[PDB]
């Protein structure tokens, strides 16, 4: 900064500067610290702090100048690292901040505590046990204040202390395992303040905003998060401090205390040893079932969340031959409650399904369990979740997404005596495939997983009926609604799943789908959709095999036009080349129609080169080369066939063998080749051996680097290169030893 920063600093340090001059400049200084990177500001940090501390000092009469300077400190902490390093400069900064927290003005008071929070978040290691009680006294008093903006800073401070000390606990745990001293050692401030922290936080849980709002962030919510972070930070230590509050207020006539009891209990469910928490959950269960039917909307919401958190963190307790029946019964009714409650109920069911599935007995010769502890309730709970789906208020609290997520999870994690209900409800879900698609992000992957799951375990004719529904929904989708880029991609990946499971039986749907597959391959602008469409063709090649023949003319046309287009993202090219191999492998001799142009494309793509410097392009070249090798492999094998002798059709690839082996030889000579490329090269060499015979051996032996590439492959770490390089060596050895008479 040529002259600017010094000008600002001088206008604060100057004793003749007016109240306006100092105050306006510190705000200007403050915003500058929010702008530039430490590149310029770390030289000036010595001078910027001089002006900042000058404005915060006890001796400054104006509170406006104090606030401006205290706010400026907050923004400058990103590069006070070198100043915090020396203890005397640290002693001065800390004293100024601590004295600023005692200022009669509230605006300064809050900003001074904001500093303690951020300093704690950044420089934990530089805080000595010396500062321990000093910081404890200021932040605890901040917590006990009637002003909410003051209370929030006191709570956030310890939440940040917990975050830092949890990472240090992790740091110490791995250091012990490895037999090392931890790089940094925890000072356990949270453990030492826990006695005093919990009574305050439990009491702050009683100050809920009766006029409820999710956007608003207040001391009551912060307290809940704080107790939760204290539970994971201090583990079993927290239990004796929170439990007497819970037990005393769980049946308080005042809803605010009753709500605090269920919250506090829910907050301590992770951290302490599950062996302590399980009997406590069992003890609290009857009361928990009562609190589900609480008159107060607030208590129910917290009760559902507590139950929903029990099911996730402590599954063995949620399943109980004693309380399961009344638990499931009240969760059913909870789906008819407000979205605040019903969403957590959905979450509870999903965890219960996983819990009941994991626990279920599976014969050690069988795939799935015959029965599980949700079988009696299965049909009822899966029906009420679908009705929860039809709720016109499903948008709020994300009820609709929670209901579908449950429905899927329940259907996935199910016993055999639930299969009729599984099949019925999964038909309904697939009927609404469009709005499930157009609906967080894992929901689509979980939908593909469940569809994959159901199709495999249900009776074959029932899987065909589900497949009929899925395709009926997708074909209606494409033909009705416009077609969003993210939506189409998810729709294609959905098709991929069905194809991979159905195999050759997908041929039913091939007619009605081919236009929409074509739209995907024609989508140059949104290449992610394109890549998915390219991927699907390969899946179709493995599924339909030679039955894809009457669909190849068009597909091949689209794939070749895609390659000829100069504006298609580079990711698409190698995938199309790979899929040429899948086509040739599927259609066999029928490929002769496309052969010339494909071989000419592969030849051009193989000779493509990028410069050594570009780290990204070198990774791309190998991805392109891998696809080139794969393509040839699919072509050589495809025209060869699976018979006794080689089909004469491969002799059309014979003129290309010289180029192919030169391409492999050039790959071998390149030190920067990948294990995937080496594997694909070794694979191709073996293929050439089986197709063309002893001549290949001679041409391989004349290119000595190929011998080295094979040696490298058999010794490689990966399973792919190991297997294929051994196979090519074996195939080359067969050609070496053929026509040799054996003797005893």
């Amino acid at each position: 900064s040529p002259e600017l920063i010094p000008q600002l600093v001088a206008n604060v340090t100057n004793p003749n500067s007016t109240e306006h001059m100092k105050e306006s400049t510190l705000e200007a200084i403050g915003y500058i610290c929010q702008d530039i990177d430490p590149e310029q500001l770390q030289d000036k940090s010595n001078e910027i702090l001089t002006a900042i501390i000058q404005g915060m000092r006890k001796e400054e009469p104006s509170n406006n100048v104090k606030l401006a300077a205290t706010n400026a400190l907050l923004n400058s902490l990103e590069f006070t690292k070198a100043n915090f390093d020396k203890e005397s400069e640290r002693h001065f900064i800390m004293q100024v901040v601590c004295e600023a927290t005692q200022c009669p003005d509230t605006r300064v008071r809050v900003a001074a505590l904001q500093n303690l929070v951020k300093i704690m978040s950044l420089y934990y290691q530089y805080m000595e046990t010396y500062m321990g009680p000093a910081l404890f006294a200021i932040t605890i008093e901040a917590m006990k204040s009637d002003i909410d903006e003051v209370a929030l800073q006191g709570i956030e401070f310890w939440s940040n202390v917990c975050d830092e000390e949890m990472d240090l606990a992790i740091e110490a745990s791995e250091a012990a395992e490895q037999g090392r001293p931890p790089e940094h050692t925890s000072k356990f401030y949270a453990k030492g303040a826990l006695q005093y922290l919990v009574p305050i936080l439990t009491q702050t849980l009683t100050k809920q905003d009766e006029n409820d709002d999710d956007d608003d962030w207040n001391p009551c919510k912060a307290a809940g998060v704080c107790l939760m972070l204290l539970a994971t930070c201090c583990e079993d230590d927290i239990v004796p401090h929170v439990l007497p509050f819970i037990k005393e207020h769980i049946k308080n006539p005042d809803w605010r205390y009753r709500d605090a009891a269920v919250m506090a209990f829910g907050c301590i469910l992770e951290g302490p040893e599950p062996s302590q928490l399980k009997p406590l959950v069992i003890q609290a269960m009857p009361t928990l079932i009562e609190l589900m039917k609480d008159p107060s909307v607030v208590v129910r919401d917290t009760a559902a969340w507590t139950v929903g958190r029990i099911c996730e963190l402590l599954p063995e307790a949620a399943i109980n031959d004693v309380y399961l029946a009344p638990l499931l019964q009240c969760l059913i009714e909870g789906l008819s409650a407000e979205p605040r409650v019903a969403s957590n109920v959905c979450w509870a069911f999903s965890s219960l399904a996983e819990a009941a599935y994991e626990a279920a007995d599976v014969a050690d010769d069988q795939e799935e369990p015959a029965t599980y502890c949700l079988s009696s309730s299965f049909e009822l709970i899966v029906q009420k979740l679908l009705e929860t789906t039809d709720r016109p208020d499903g948008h709020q609290n994300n009820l609709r997404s929670s209901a579908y997520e449950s429905l899927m999870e329940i259907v996935k994690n199910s016993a055999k005596d639930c299969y009729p209900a599984v099949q019925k409800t999964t038909l309904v879900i697939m009927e609404r495939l469009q709005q499930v698609l157009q609906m967080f992000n894992d929901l689509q992957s979980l939908l593909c997983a469940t569809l994959q799951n159901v199709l495999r375990k249900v009776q074959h004719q029932d899987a065909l009926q589900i497949s009929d529904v899925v395709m009926a929904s997708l074909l209606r989708m494409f033909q009705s609604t416009a077609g969003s880029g993210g939506v189409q991609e998810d729709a294609l990946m959905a098709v991929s799943t069905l194809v991979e499971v159905l195999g050759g039986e997908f041929l039913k749907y091939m007619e009605a789908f081919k236009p929409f597959l074509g739209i995907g391959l024609k989508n140059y602008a949104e290449y992610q959709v394109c890549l998915a469409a390219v991927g699907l063709v390969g899946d179709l090649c493995r599924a339909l095999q030679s039955n894809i023949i009457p669909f190849c003319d068009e597909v091949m046309q689209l794939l070749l036009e895609n390659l000829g287009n100069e504006n298609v993202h580079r990711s698409v090219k190698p995938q199309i080349l790979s899929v040429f191999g899948d086509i040739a492998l599927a259609i066999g001799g029928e490929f002769k129609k496309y052969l010339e142009v494909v071989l000419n494309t592969l030849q051009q793509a193989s000779q493509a080169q990028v410069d050594k410097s570009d780290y990204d392009m070198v990774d791309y070249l190998n991805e392109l080369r891998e696809s080139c090798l794969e393509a040839y492999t699919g072509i050589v094998q495809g025209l060869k066939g699976d018979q006794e002798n080689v089909h004469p059709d491969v002799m059309l690839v014979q003129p290309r063998v010289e180029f192919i082996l030169s391409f492999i030889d050039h790959i071998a000579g390149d030190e920067d080749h990948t294990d995937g490329v080496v594997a694909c090269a070794a694979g191709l060499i073996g293929d050439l051996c089986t197709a063309f015979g002893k001549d290949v051996l001679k041409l391989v032996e004349a290119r000595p680097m190929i011998h080295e590439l094979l040696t490298e492959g058999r010794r490689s770490k990966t399973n792919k290169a190991k297997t294929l390089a051994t196979w090519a060596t074996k195939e080359l050895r067969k050609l070496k030893n053929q026509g040799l008479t054996r003797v005893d």
């Binding site: 992000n441 991979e500 899946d539 493995r542 492998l585 794969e630 094998q637 196979w727």
Partner: peptide, 30 residues
């Protein structure tokens, strides 16, 4: 989104392995 990238990578790997299984069947391996 980070969730959509991993959803994309997982499918490509699966398609690549299924391709390898089909070719190695034609090659007669393992």
């Amino acid at each position: 989104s980070l969730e959509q990238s991993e959803r994309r990578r997982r499918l490509l790997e699966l398609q690549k392995s299924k391709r390898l299984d089909y070719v190695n069947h034609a090659r007669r391996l393992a």
